[PDB]
C-alpha cells in the first residue's frame, strides 16, 4: 500500500526535496508527517508535497489524459484537461463504457479515448 | 493544482 504516482510538477527548492514530474511513480517511504512525505522515485529519495500525489492500487492503470473532457458533477462524469494525470482500472479493448478514475480530490466517470496509458 | 505547503519540511 506503499505505491503512488505524482500528479502534479514539484520542483525542488530545498535541501532532500524529491523532484516530482507528472507520472513518476513513487514508492511512500514516510507519511509521518500530514503534509510533506518522503518517497522513492527511480534512484532518488526525498520529501515532496503529499496532496501532490494520487495512490496507485494493485490492478489500477495510470493515464494521461491525450483529448480534453467536459465533465457533468450531476452525472459524476470528472473532467480531463490535456496532461492530466488519473488512475483507475482500464477495461479490454471489447468492453464498453467510462471508466471510474481519481485525479487527486477529484473522482468519477470518464471516457476511456480522452487517456492515454502510462 | 493544490498549493506547496507552508508548513515546514520535516
Keep these: 500500500a506503499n505505491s503512488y504516482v505524482a500528479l502534479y510538477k514539484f520542483l525542488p527548492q530545498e535541501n532532500n526535496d524529491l523532484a516530482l514530474q507528472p507520472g513518476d511513480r513513487i514508492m511512500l517511504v514516510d507519511d509521518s508527517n500530514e503534509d510533506w512525505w518522503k518517497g522513492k522515485i527511480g534512484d532518488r529519495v526525498g520529501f515532496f508535497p503529499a496532496?501532490?500525489?494520487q495512490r496507485v492500487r494493485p490492478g489500477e492503470n495510470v493515464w494521461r489524459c491525450c483529448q480534453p473532457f467536459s465533465g457533468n458533477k450531476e452525472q459524476g462524469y470528472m473532467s480531463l484537461k490535456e496532461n492530466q494525470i488519473c488512475?483507475?482500472?482500464?477495461?479490454?479493448?471489447?468492453?464498453?463504457?467510462?471508466?471510474?478514475?481519481?485525479?487527486?480530490?477529484?473522482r468519477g466517470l470518464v471516457p476511456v479515448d480522452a487517456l492515454t496509458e502510462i | 493544482e493544490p498549493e506547496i505547503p507552508l508548513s515546514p519540511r520535516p
Excluded: E, L, P, Q
Design chain 1, 51 to 53: 496532496n501532490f500525489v
Design chain 1, 87 to 106: 488512475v483507475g482500472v482500464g477495461r479490454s479493448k471489447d468492453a464498453d463504457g467510462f471508466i471510474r478514475v481519481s485525479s487527486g480530490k477529484k
